[PDB]
């Protein structure tokens, strides 16, 4: 849907890795609300 916030937050460094089967899950839509930043989408956005 890509109705995501996408503002530079103070993000919390958590221990658990969530990368397991991640891109395949986001490929077929496990979530309704998710965003795929590739390359120079991955800048922390402007205020």
């Amino acid at each position: 849907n890509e109705g995501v916030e996408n503002r530079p937050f103070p993000y919390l460094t958590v221990d658990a890795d969530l990368l397991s089967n991640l891109r395949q899950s986001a490929a077929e839509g496990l979530f309704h609300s998710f965003d795929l930043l590739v390359g120079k989408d991955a800048r922390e956005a402007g205020i």
Binding site: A16, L18, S20, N21, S25, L30
Partner: protein, 140 residues
């Protein structure tokens, strides 16, 4: 008892009761316990209908699945895996042939209009509106 020119297949459903397992990982969801509240809703002369309110808010803490459910053992088969063709004079009752003589004869020679009492889910019906187990509905 001769064969016609066609050859049907028959589809049923068979309800199988189980006793499921439920696993979920540690701290799968994060919930908020709201404070319970009491509220009266109807206050007639003899008794006052109370009502308690409570609300919770459940949110996930992981991305992928974190809870699962498997059917462990069969308890029993709640339906009879039998022969009960559902009556097409009841699911399409507005259909009728040319004469009334031939239609009445056809409804006579087949099992037509055998249970016209319930034509909906009886849980939706109130309290107090073929004496064997649950007939699996065949279809042709």
């Amino acid at each position: 008892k001769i064969h016609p020119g066609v050859a049907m297949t028959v589809v049923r459903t068979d309800e199988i009761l189980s006793e499921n397992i439920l696993f979920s990982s540690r701290a799968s969801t994060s919930m908020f316990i709201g404070t319970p509240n009491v509220s009266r809703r109807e206050a007639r002369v003899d008794a006052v209908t109370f009502e308690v309110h409570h609300e919770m808010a459940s949110i996930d803490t992981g991305l992928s699945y974190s809870s699962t459910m498997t059917p462990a053992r069969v308890a029993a088969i709640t339906t009879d895996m039998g022969i009960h063709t559902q009556d097409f004079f009841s699911v399409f009752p507005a259909e009728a042939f040319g004469n009334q003589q031939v239609n009445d004869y056809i409804k006579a020679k087949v099992g037509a209009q055998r249970n016209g009492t319930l034509l909906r889910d009886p849980r939706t019906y109130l309290a107090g509106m073929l004496c064997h187990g649950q007939q699996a509905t065949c279809e042709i």
